[PDB]
Amino acid sequence: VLSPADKTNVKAAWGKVGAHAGEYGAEALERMFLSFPTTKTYFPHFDLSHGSAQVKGHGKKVADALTNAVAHVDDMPNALSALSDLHAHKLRVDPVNFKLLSHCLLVTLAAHLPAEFTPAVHASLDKFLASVSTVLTSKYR
């Protein structure tokens, strides 16, 4: 459950991301593909080379979804409804992979926000990513 302090922390950190969201999304994906090779099995149709426009394009979509989730933090299930349908019935990504991407998103945020990534914000962001992950897999079965 996200407490009001958690919401403030998430809104503050994401606000600093601002216009760089898409670039951070792509970097997070790159970190994931390199660190956890098995995640590449869901993108056999992509060029996963560093600099790939496909990865850059996808990172931007992932980041925009997160931006939408932050804006509707008090109403995530409905805001992400189409996305949970998509992952549950079409993409069918095994649930463990959401933990792998979440970690990589955290690492990306840490490497770019030295001043804002305090222990408290780290905890709030991890709680936030776990909630997003939960909503995205809520219709799996």
Partner 1 sequence: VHLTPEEKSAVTALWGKVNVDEVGGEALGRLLVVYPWTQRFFESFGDLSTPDAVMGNPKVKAHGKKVLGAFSDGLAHLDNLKGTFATLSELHCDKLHVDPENFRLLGNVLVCVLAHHFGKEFTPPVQAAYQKVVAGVANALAHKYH
Binding stretches for ligand HEM (CB under 6 A): 39, 42-43, 58, 61-62, 65-66, 83, 87, 91, 93, 97-98, 101, 132, 136
User: Could you tell me the smallest distance in angstroms from the CB atom of residue 91 to ligand RQ3?
Assistant: 13
6 touches partner 1 (CB under 8 A) = no
Q: Helices (H) and strands (E) in the chain — how many of each?
A: 7, 0
Burial of 121 (0-12, 13-18, 19+ CB in 10 A): buried
**Interface with partner 1 in residues 36-75 (CB under 8 A):** 36-39, 41-42, 44, 50
Quote the tokens at residue 112.
């770019």
CA 83 to chain CA centroid, Å, is: 12
Q: Which of 2, 54, 126, 134 binds partner 1 (CB under 8 A)?
A: 126
98: which residues sit within 8 A by CB, 6+ positions away? Answer: 133, 136, 137
SS3 call for 13: helix
**Interface with ligand RQ3 in residues 73-112 (CB under 6 A):** 95-96, 99-100, 103
Give which of ligand HEM, a second copy, partner 1, none residue 1 binds (C-beta under 5 to 8 Å, depending on kind). a second copy
Total number of residues that touch a second copy (CB under 8 A): 6
